[PDB]
Ligand binder design. Sequence first.
Ligand SMILES: Cc1cc2nc3c(=O)[nH]c(=O)nc-3n(C[C@H](O)[C@H](O)[C@H](O)COP(=O)(O)O)c2cc1C
Ligand SMILES: CC(C)[C@H]1CC(=O)c2nnn(-c3cc(F)c(-c4cccc(N(C)C)c4)c(F)c3)c2C1
Ligand SMILES: CCCCCCCCCCCC[N+](C)(C)[O-]
Ligand SMILES: O=C(O)c1cc(=O)[nH]c(=O)[nH]1
Length: 363
Amino acid sequence: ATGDERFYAEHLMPTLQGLLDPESAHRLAVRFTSLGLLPFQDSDMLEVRVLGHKFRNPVGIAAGFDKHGEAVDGLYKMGFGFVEIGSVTPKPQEGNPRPRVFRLPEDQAVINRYGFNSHGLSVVEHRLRARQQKQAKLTEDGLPLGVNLGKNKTSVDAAEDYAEGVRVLGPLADYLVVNVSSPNTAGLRSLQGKAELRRLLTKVLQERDGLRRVHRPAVLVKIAPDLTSQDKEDIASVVKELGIDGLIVTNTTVSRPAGLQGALRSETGGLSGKPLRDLSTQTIREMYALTQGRVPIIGVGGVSSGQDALEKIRAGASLVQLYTALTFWGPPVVGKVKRELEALLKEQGFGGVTDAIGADHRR
Ligand SMILES: Cc1cc2nc3c(=O)[nH]c(=O)nc-3n(C[C@H](O)[C@H](O)[C@H](O)COP(=O)(O)O)c2cc1C
Ligand SMILES: CC(C)[C@H]1CC(=O)c2nnn(-c3cc(F)c(-c4cccc(N(C)C)c4)c(F)c3)c2C1
Ligand SMILES: CCCCCCCCCCCC[N+](C)(C)[O-]
Ligand SMILES: O=C(O)c1cc(=O)[nH]c(=O)[nH]1
């Protein structure tokens, strides 16, 4: 309940929404963040050790905000415990024609169909190289960096696209994400099927294992919220079989939950924000159980509060991410989630975040 929190949520963000279309607002958000034009101290309680790293707090920025790696340091300054950039495709590509981003203010939601607009691996590679040693120190300080990998629209061999991403950006990342769950690239989600996924992930892991030790990232798979029970079983099996390091749960949904009020609810694309929240949480809950709690989960979808974050943690997430909440609360949402999360942990008798991970499954 800070002053900045209310000001941003009641006055500044509604005004910015009134003046700028969603994509323009996105571009401005990236610009301001990259320039440090931004408005809470992390306690030991919020520290998490997973994926071979220390995370000083469990609240990350989800993929899709900083697609091209332009605002990484600004995002740490915003208070995120870790930053994920991407998705990045091998070659540059423009993505879908505009308009391709839509606000649903009545639903605290967004729909997007960007279609992997990407500066490409080479540009992002040089952008990260320019701050590689700074990042090494941040990572050692408990502020890790993730790189989310996509594939080009016209690509003939999906596995080769991801392999290229591993080779080029793997050495610059604490973890990589095989994003096989964007709803805006034709045929992409079918790579979530068992046979396809096993081949794909085998190639990715081999390429990863071929990197020098200090440049060898964890590999996670990011999945949709729209999977069948069969799909989820298959993914859990393959992940355990191959020793995948973790899961990101979830991407946006192509479903349209009953009760959406936004005028733009029937736009094509992935839906994010509050209407996704519990769908995402239940997918975390299921994947945690299917993997016996032995596979770290980063929980994502509709987080805007400590309660939202804690529900995903108790469902099985070791870390969480948010993105869409920024549209409505702005940068203060990060400190807000961290403060509320700490208070709830104390209130529910947890020694820290680590004690709460998967707690719903143990009672
Ligand atoms: C505009 C927009 C762009 C996104 N781009 C990507 C992306 O490139 N790669 C990816 O894995 N997820 C992408 N996402 C999904 C987010 O990373 C996240 O999984 C999802 O939005 C749910 O979290 P949220 O409700 O807090 O926004 C994007 C989401 C939005 C809203
Ligand atoms: C989800 C994404 C596609 C869009 C969707 C959308 O419709 C939207 N509308 N506004 N907005 C947005 C604009 C912003 F300028 C910042 C921002 C960032 C950093 C600093 C500041 N300030 C100093 C005030 C502001 C922000 F966090 C979010 C978004 C994000
Ligand atoms: C300012 C708008 C705030 C809207 C907050 C939404 C609260 C949760 C309701 C969405 C639930 C979607 N569903 C059916 C999939 O659970
Ligand atoms: O680039 C996009 O359209 C996109 C990619 C992704 O993984 N998720 C999403 O909602 N959009």
